[PDB]
Amino acid sequence: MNELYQLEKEPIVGAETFYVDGAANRETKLGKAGYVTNRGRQKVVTLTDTTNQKTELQAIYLALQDSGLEVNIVTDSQYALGIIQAQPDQSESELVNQIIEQLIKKEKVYLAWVPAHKGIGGNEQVDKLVSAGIRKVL
């Protein structure tokens, strides 16, 4: 049970695989954020005052919404990496707070991110055709 859920954030013994990634202009803290679960689900949301990593944090809540018990939350965010991993049930960022509460009523989500911007679940060397849109990730 740990603090408020099963501290995973790393390779899980055997949990469902989920994706999480959103693009929202950091400089303005706004844009889109969605996810795709192994059940073939796809959602999207707008960011408000949320940092680049928080854009993925909000989206993180998505993969955590239909996650279930134990899933693999693949999200590009070194911030969540720091907070979302540190049981942010009530620490630092406010987003991770909501994300954890949901993580509480479940098992565990493997949250990972490696220096880049195109390393998530299903991308296929393409995000959403960036045409100078105002949804760049810092």
Side-chain angles (χ1 to χ4, degrees):
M1 56 115 100
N2 213 80
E3 255 73 42
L4 242 329
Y5 55 86
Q6 277 100 150
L7 230 132
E8 195 48 62
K9 310 108 210 282
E10 55 188 58
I12 320 175
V13 53
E16 224 80 330
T17 82
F18 278 54
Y19 150 112
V20 238
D21 169 67
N25 199 115
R26 208 286 323 179
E27 173 158 319
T28 321
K29 301 113 207 284
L30 154 153
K32 327 103 75 97
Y35 105 94
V36 59
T37 163
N38 84 134
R39 320 176 141 283
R41 152 141 276 96
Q42 274 274 270
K43 4 251 274 281
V44 76
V45 289
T46 69
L47 284 314
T48 17
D49 317 292
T50 74
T51 345
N52 66 114
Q53 271 125 259
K54 257 91 281 247
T55 81
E56 340 263 322
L57 214 19
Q58 170 47 66
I60 263 146
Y61 147 96
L62 311 172
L64 260 131
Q65 272 275 297
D66 299 52
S67 52
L69 249 182
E70 39 181 285
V71 300
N72 281 233
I73 284 227
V74 197
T75 337
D76 330 315
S77 158
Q78 35 227 314
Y79 235 119
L81 193 159
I83 344 293
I84 228 285
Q85 183 192 46
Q87 312 98 107
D89 356 302
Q90 21 55 70
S91 309
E92 219 96 47
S93 244
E94 68 124 60
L95 225 49
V96 270
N97 266 226
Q98 210 337 86
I99 278 117
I100 292 313
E101 260 262 274
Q102 246 46 215
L103 220 173
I104 301 173
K105 29 158 272 104
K106 67 179 77 286
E107 171 103 33
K108 58 173 106 263
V109 300
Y110 145 72
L111 242 125
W113 175 223
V114 174
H117 250 357
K118 48 277 170 162
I120 342 109
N123 205 55
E124 196 44 58
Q125 228 68 227
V126 62
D127 224 1
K128 250 255 160 130
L129 225 139
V130 270
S131 185
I134 320 299
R135 65 264 291 197
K136 64 179 209 173
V137 256
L138 201 89

